[PDB]
C-alpha cells in the first residue's frame, strides 16, 4: 500500500507498517514525487499485475484487466460514474482468501491505498456520463432510476 508523509516516521518493521495499513514487504521503498499522477502510476501497476496473472483463478484473471481498463479510461479523462465504486469493489473482492494465491491481494493493495489517500485524481478522471448501451430503433429503453 501507498503511505503518506505522516507515515515516514514509522520504524521499518512488520508490525508497525502493518498497523499503518500497509506491509513491510521487501523493505525496498519507492518514493513518489508530486509530478507523478497517481492514476497513471496505479494504471502502470495494474497493467503489470494483470499481465502477470497466471490465469488460474477468475477474480485476478478477469477483474484485474477490468481495473486496468477503468484506470486507462480515468487516465484519458473518459471515466464514467460508478468507476471508483467498481474499483473499490474489485479491491474488496480480490483480497486475501478470495483468490487462489496472493498475487491479486498484492495487486489491489496500491489501488486501495491510492483511492484512500489521493481520491481527487480518481474523481478528476470521471468526465463522461455512464453508458454501455446504444439505442435500438424500435425499442423504448427501460429508463432506470
Amino acid at each position: 500500500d501507498f503511505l503518506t508523509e505522516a507515515h515516514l516516521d514509522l520504524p521499518m518493521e512488520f508490525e508497525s507498517i502493518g498497523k499503518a495499513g500497509s506491509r513491510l514487504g521487501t523493505a525496498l521503498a519507492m518514493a513518489v514525487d508530486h509530478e507523478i499522477n497517481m492514476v497513471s502510476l496505479v494504471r502502470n501497476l495494474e497493467e503489470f499485475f494483470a499481465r502477470e496473472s497466471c490465469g488460474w483463478c477468475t477474480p485476478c484473471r478477469d477483474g484485474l484487466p477490468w481495473s486496468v481498463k477503468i484506470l486507462r479510461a480515468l487516465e484519458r479523462g473518459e471515466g464514467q460514474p460508478g468507476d471508483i465504486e467498481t474499483l473499490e469493489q474489485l479491491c474488496r473482492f480480490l483480497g486475501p482468501g478470495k483468490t487462489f494465491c496472493a498475487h491479486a491481494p498484492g495487486a489491489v493493495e496500491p489501488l486501495q491505498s491510492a483511492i484512500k489517500y489521493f481520491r481527487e485524481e480518481f474523481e478528476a478522471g470521471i468526465k463522461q456520463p455512464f453508458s454501455n448501451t446504444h439505442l435500438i430503433n424500435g425499442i423504448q429503453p427501460n429508463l432506470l432510476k
Partner: protein, 576 residues
C-alpha cells in the same frame, strides 16, 4: 420489511383466540406469502373452528373461497402436516378487515370432509367443484354432484395424475351426448338436481338458455318455487392450464378468464407472481397498471349498463374509443396480455397523453347522458326497483362482492380496504347504497363507479411518473429488450426465462383485487419449479350465480331475467 415477505402472522389476534379456545396443539401455523394467517386444522375440528370464527366479537362472516389441492407431487412441504390432498377455506372478517385460511389435510384413502354448508351456504357450489375436480367427498352435502364436468365423466381433472391435454375426439360419444340431450326432458328426474315435489300436478319443470347457460325452473303457474342453474358449459380448464404453462406464458390465460376485463384480470396474477418472486415494482408500473385497469373497468361497466338498459327497454362509441387507446398502448383491444412479471411488456407509446386527454375531455358529457338515461328514467326505475332485493346478511352469507355488496351498505372495496398497485396514491370515492341491493341500486353504483374511474384516469394522466416500466429485479420476466439485445447476461436471463421459465422459489402467494364484477383473486402455489404447482382463481361470477335461487324464490320468470341482466357476470368467469 417488504409487502412480499414470508410471514407466519402469529401476532394476528385470531391466532391467539384459536390458541386460547382449542389449545396450542390443535392447529399448525404455516408461514406463507399470502398475507393471510394460514392454519392447518384437524378434520374432526373443522366445524368447531368454523363455528368459533363465526361467533367472534368481530366475526369472520364470509366464506371467500373453498377448494382442494393435490399435494402428492409437492416436494417442498417443510413445516406442513402429512397430506396427500388438502382442502382450504378462505374466510373474511369485514369488520376486522382480516382474513384467515384454514387447511384440512387428507390422506389418499380417506377423501371425505364434513360439509361446510351449515355455516356458509356458498360452500355448496364450492364443495361441488372440489368434488368434481378432485374427488373429495363432503359428508352431509345435500346434492354432491358434478358442477363443471358432465355427470357421465370419468376421473377428477384437477388431480395430478389426470392428463391435462385434450383427448382424442370420438363421434360416437358426441352422438351419445346428443341422445342424452334428446330425451333429457322426457327422462327428467327432479331428484338428480336437488329439487322436490316433482309433479301436486301443478309444478312445471323447464330448461332455459354474459354467456349461454341453462337453469331448470320449477314453476307454480308463473311463480318460481325453486331453480338450479346448470353451469360448466363454458369450462376451459384454466387452473389445470396454470399447471401446464410457465409463470410467464400463463398470462394470456389470465386474460381470457373474465374476457370483458383484460388487464384487470392480468393484475392479480402478476401481483401474486411478483409476491412469489419478491418483486417490488416501481411507481410508474403501478400507475400504468392502474390506468389500464381503470380503462377496462370503464369499458366493462359501459357494456354492462348498456346491456341492462336495452334488456329492460329504456354505448358503442365510448367502448370504441377505449379500445382504440388500449390498442395503441398494447397492440390488442380485447385480450392485451400486456402486464408482465416485474412490469409491463413495453413502455407507454409516444402520444398516449394525447389519446387519453381526448378520451377524458369527451367523456363527462356522456356521463351526464348515462345518468339522465338511467337515474332519471321512470320506466327503468319502476321495472328495476325491488326486484331480487337482498340485504347485508344475504350478501355476506353468499360471498357477494362488488356492486351488490356495496349496495347492501357494506363499504368493502379492495382498492381501499387492502390497497394494491399503488391505489392508495389516488383520491377516489367508493359509492355505497342503502341497505337494499336490488337491480336499480346495483346499476346506480356501477354508474358512480364509472365516474370515480374517470377521476382515477384523470389522476393517472396528470402526474404519470417518469421512470422504468420494468423492475430492476433479476426475476423480472422478460428483461428489458434493449439490454437483452445488447448485453450477454441479460440475453442469458431472457433465454432462460422465455424457454424453461423463471424459477419461482417454493412458496404460496395470494392476491385479491377489485375486478369489474367483484373480487377476483389468484392463489398460487409454487413448488420451486418454472410452472405453477397450483393456480386457484376465485371469481365473483361463480358466487353471484350461486346466489340466484336464494334471491328470486317466489318471483316471476321476468323478474329472473331482470335479475340476470342486473348481475354483472359472464359465463367464462363462472366456469373458468
Amino acid at each position: 420489511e417488504p409487502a412480499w415477505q414470508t410471514r407466519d402472522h402469529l401476532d394476528d389476534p385470531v391466532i391467539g383466540e384459536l390458541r386460547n379456545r382449542f389449545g396450542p396443539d390443535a392447529f399448525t401455523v404455516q408461514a406463507t406469502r399470502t398475507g393471510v394467517p394460514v392454519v392447518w386444522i384437524k378434520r374432526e375440528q373443522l366445524l368447531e373452528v368454523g363455528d368459533f370464527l363465526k361467533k367472534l366479537p368481530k366475526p369472520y362472516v364470509m366464506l371467500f373461497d373453498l377448494h382442494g389441492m393435490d399435494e402428492r407431487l409437492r416436494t417442498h412441504r417443510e413445516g406442513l402436516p402429512a397430506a396427500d390432498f388438502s382442502v382450504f377455506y378462505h374466510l373474511i372478517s369485514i369488520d376486522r378487515n382480516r382474513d384467515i385460511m384454514l387447511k384440512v389435510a387428507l390422506a389418499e384413502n380417506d377423501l371425505h370432509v364434513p360439509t361446510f354448508t351449515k355455516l356458509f351456504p356458498n360452500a355448496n357450489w364450492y364443495e361441488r367443484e372440489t368434488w368434481d375436480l378432485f374427488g373429495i367427498t363432503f359428508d352431509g352435502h345435500p346434492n354432491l354432484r358434478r358442477i363443471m364436468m358432465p355427470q357421465t365423466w370419468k376421473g377428477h381433472p384437477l388431480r395430478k395424475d389426470y392428463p391435462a391435454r385434450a383427448t382424442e375426439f370420438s363421434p360416437f360419444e358426441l352422438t351419445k351426448a346428443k341422445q342424452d340431450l334428446e330425451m333429457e326432458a322426457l327422462t327428467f328426474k327432479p331428484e338428480e338436481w336437488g329439487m322436490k315435489r316433482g309433479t301436486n300436478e301443478d309444478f312445471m319443470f323447464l330448461n332455459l338458455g354474459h354467456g349461454a347457460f341453462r337453469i331448470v325452473l320449477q314453476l307454480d303457474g308463473e311463480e318460481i318455487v325453486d331453480c338450479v342453474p346448470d353451469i360448466g358449459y363454458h369450462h376451459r380448464g384454466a387452473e389445470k392450464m396454470g399447471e401446464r404453462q410457465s409463470w410467464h406464458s400463463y398470462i394470456p390465460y389470465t386474460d381470457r378468464i373474465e374476457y370483458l376485463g383484460g388487464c384487470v384480470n392480468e393484475m392479480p396474477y402478476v401481483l401474486a407472481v411478483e409476491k412469489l418472486a419478491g418483486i417490488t415494482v416501481p411507481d410508474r408500473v403501478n400507475v400504468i397498471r392502474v390506468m389500464l385497469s381503470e380503462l377496462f373497468r370503464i369499458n366493462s361497466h359501459l357494456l354492462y349498463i348498456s346491456t341492462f338498459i336495452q334488456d329492460v327497454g329504456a354505448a358503442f362509441t365510448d367502448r370504441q374509443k377505449i379500445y382504440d387507446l388500449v390498442e395503441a398502448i398494447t397492440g390488442f383491444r380485447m385480450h392485451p396480455a400486456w402486464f408482465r412479471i416485474g412490469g409491463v411488456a413495453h413502455d407507454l407509446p409516444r402520444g398516449w397523453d394525447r389519446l387519453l386527454r381526448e378520451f377524458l375531455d369527451w367523456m363527462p358529457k356522456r356521463l351526464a347522458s348515462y345518468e339522465k338515461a338511467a337515474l332519471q328514467n321512470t320506466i327503468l326505475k319502476g321495472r328495476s326497483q325491488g326486484v331480487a332485493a337482498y340485504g347485508a346478511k344475504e350478501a355476506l352469507e353468499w360471498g357477494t362482492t362488488g356492486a351488490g355488496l356495496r349496495a347492501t351498505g357494506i363499504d368493502f372495496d379492495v382498492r381501499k380496504a387492502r390497497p394494491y398497485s399503488g391505489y392508495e396514491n389516488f383520491d377516489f370515492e367508493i359509492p355505497v347504497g342503502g341497505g337494499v341491493s336490488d337491480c336499480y341500486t346495483r346499476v346506480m353504483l356501477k354508474v358512480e363507479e364509472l365516474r370515480q374511474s374517470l377521476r382515477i384516469l384523470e389522476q393517472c394522466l396528470n402526474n404519470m411518473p417518469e421512470g422504468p416500466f420494468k423492475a430492476d429485479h433479476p426475476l423480472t420476466t422478460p428483461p428489458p429488450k434493449e439490454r437483452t439485445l445488447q448485453h450477454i447476461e441479460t440475453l442469458i436471463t431472457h433465454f432462460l426465462q422465455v424457454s424453461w421459465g423463471p424459477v419461482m422459489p417454493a412458496n404460496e402467494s395470494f392476491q385479491m383485487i377489485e375486478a369489474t364484477k367483484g373480487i377476483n383473486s389468484y392463489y398460487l402455489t409454487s413448488d420451486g419449479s418454472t410452472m405453477s404447482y397450483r393456480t386457484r382463481v376465485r371469481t365473483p361470477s361463480f358466487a353471484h350465480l350461486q346466489q340466484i335461487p336464494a334471491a328470486i324464490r317466489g318471483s316471476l320468470v321476468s323478474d329472473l331475467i331482470v335479475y340476470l341482466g342486473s348481475i354483472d357476470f359472464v359465463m367464462s368467469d363462472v366456469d373458468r
